[model samples]
Target: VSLMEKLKWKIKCIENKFLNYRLTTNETVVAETEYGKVKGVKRLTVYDDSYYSFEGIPYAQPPVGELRFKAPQRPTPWAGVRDCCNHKDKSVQVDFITGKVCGSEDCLYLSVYTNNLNPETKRPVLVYIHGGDFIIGENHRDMYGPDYFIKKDVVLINIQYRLGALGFLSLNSEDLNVPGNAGLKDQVMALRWIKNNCANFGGNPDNITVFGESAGAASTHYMMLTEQTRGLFHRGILMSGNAICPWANTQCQHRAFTLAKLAGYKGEDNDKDVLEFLMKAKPQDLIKLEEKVLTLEERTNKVMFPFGPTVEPYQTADCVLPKHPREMVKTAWGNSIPTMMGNTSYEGLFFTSILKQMPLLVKELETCVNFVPSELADAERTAPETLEMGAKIKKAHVTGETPTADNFMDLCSHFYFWFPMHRLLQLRFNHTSGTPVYLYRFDFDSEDLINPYRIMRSGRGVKGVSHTDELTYFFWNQLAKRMPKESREYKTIERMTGIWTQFATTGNPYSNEIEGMENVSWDPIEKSDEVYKCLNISDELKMIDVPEMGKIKQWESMFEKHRDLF
Candidate 1:
């Protein structure tokens, strides 16, 4: 090596000499197994002697070609060391509509970060699954790095599964074998891998915690209901979404009919023929077909398309579906696995804000809803309008004025995000057995950024925490989109890190060692009649009951009462 390079290496070596955690010698480390030597990152310090990381270690073979619509199979062993440092290649994720694939079909890989590599200290394992509504996300995303978990002396495993059309498009039939939700099957396999191999990495294979956010959290909840995922995880944490009934159960026909239409078909697949055609289409073509479905002429409040898990009735040899998530919890099937569930204060603000910026008005109700003028007469009565002074529209023999853009936002939050989360938690917490459920409403607001709700009125006066705003506290990274290099929120970030670390170490998530332990009045979530403590990020940490929850519930019930109108 050159002299300067050698000096730089020596400097890093000296700096890492007394480090609490091990610095990885090689950026990547490979663990040899009978199937294959999984690759990961290794820490370089003495205490970190127990820590190691395996990123993108495939648990199932690529689900492309003939296997596209089939169930995930255990990954076959490779001949030599594999390169898992890079992500398998991400597919189309939700939130973005690009006809691009940044990952691989060999997409069943998982990444593991651990603090028990010594084979002596059998630390508990925390396996994390990422949430992107089952469509767009990756486990190797920079936000999910392992720096904090490694220092806390726990083993952490982050996983990446299939997304979009590649994951959840199923043709319902008997001979069709595995027609949908191959992505979820990949997750089941990863859990099975932990049950089988965590011990070799110095983890207590018996003590595994599977935690996730959004769709990832919902998948975790589904696993809890299924006998197939039983014994795979001892605990779970649901961040934003819930598992009960799939959106298709109520929205409309379950299949991606538009995709089939694009491929010159009119109905659901009767056999595996449709599955084969979808598998071979170019990635770009697939994305186009998905967009056609998402932005259809109907423009109804359809269940999200392209990527969502399917309900497999008597599908798996294990019969993956047992009961709806709430029923499973009520029957004490998944209640033993302790859980923590919560949502951001203004969850729907992220979406409604975008809708309001388009100059929406009663004049365009039909255009907005993609309905005809006759339909517009019915839509104007209920839909909110963004109009100037002295504009009036009548519908259904009623002359009542419609809501403005601001009130539309309120309607979205009350109906879509806040109340739905409250209802799910109420149902799950009440039904689940033995398990102690904890709840929190994330209310932190960061000041310095392009308003997350751009022109939306949700943040006009006060700030209600939106989706992903809470993640800043849990993950501390200098290089994130949220800026002002050093902000006051850093202190809160540190506190949150401690809280998460403690939760990983002990089943209970309290920090007696921290100064504000007394202030952290962690309580168990109760029935719908009661509420759990919420984190109010202001002058000082305060706990408050959800007074607004009841109002939100009333609004939500109205929607349910008249579901056919939408």
Candidate 2:
């Protein structure tokens, strides 16, 4: 054939493989979900595969009006075929800095992407939950996309849940009138929906893996503990988050009452009356009222995620987390599954970047420790033991001739991020039986000049990576695309996506499925001492023994006496 004819033949071959390769005769991209029939779109990708994407599938009823703050209810059944080709509105959330409101109360939706549309092919399913400290993030393609995982033959599902006070308000109700963890229940409800309907989208309900970063990671850990998610998923991947992290759960009753007062709630002082008043108030008003809470964090020079998962009252039957996170992990409450957890080298940079302006807070050092759960304004009421521990932390972390921004960054990173991550891993390693616990420390940094987190590395004068830096490797980040093919950042992305997908498919992350990584023995942390065996992911990825043992020892020593404070 001529050169032009040969090019024409190649084009025809490509079309024949993706465009004409139908699963069934006149196969319409439609699936029969439990609620009703829904239509998805068949998308061809550069990865040489065609995947079916079902976006904006409602998993639960809109938690508006009477249903607000209550546990998520099953999505009311709909009639006819629902067009699920478009993305849904994100859950209701107001921007902390910009005060911009962008979502709705009626936003309980999920999206599914799969290469195989046939139910016979039981491919592994990866259900992702976005993380914004349980106050932001949406079930959209922006943060996480199916471009990488679907190429590996695993289905990807992204879900949206309630956020802020609407999801986590704890009124201490006598009855189950307004139970806490409304966001968590939304996740449970979405998982239940996936279990029943995933098969229709060619996903194996039996082999579902719930994975997330930050708050999403905590949510994944929460699912492992809750009986509500008993058979919902088989594995979990927590990146930079777990249930035992200091900021994971909130002691929300006082915060709720404070918010009520700020919102001009003039009802009776009792819990029932307060709950009624707050629930009746506008969602926007509630989020705006929490500006006072943010101001509290700023004034005290302490980091505060005012609303999050809470230990629900014992009287509530549908409560997601009934006990403290430490208690839950120590007791190993539910069935243990293969779990993969990790954190970036400098998680503190995420918080410190915002607090860098306040030299007094960083210089004082004690104020930094007192940010999350501590009420440092009441110095007299503050535990004497905590003060001593804080001093010890200052001695260990901020010991320099002059406390520079670098010292502040390192101190906060270890105390806030690395220490909590290590402690949680230690607890899980010791308590969780019959499950493999894979740990990693992400140290990869992009050389891209426009990298949003480039400020973190340049400003701190530190030799560490920032929080969510590893996400660039997993997701198709814009800066990642700017990197050259021979660059270490590009290679790390290749390695990470391979390992993540390998973990999602099988319980183990290190396997023959990942090329070049098969020989690398990534061992599980079976004991507390084995935590140092975590894979340090960087340009030069290798298994490193506890590099930060000093910080670990310092935190460990403090927690030994003041375990209850955390």
Per-residue lDDT tens digits for candidate 2, residues 484-535, read 6576765676678778877877888876554355457888876645346778
Best by TM-score: 2
Candidate 2 residue-wise lDDT at 209: 91
Report the Cα lDDT for candidate 2: 0.71
TM of each candidate vs. truth: 0.77, 0.86
Residue 178 miss distance in model 1 (angstroms): 3.1
Clashing pairs in 2: 302-371
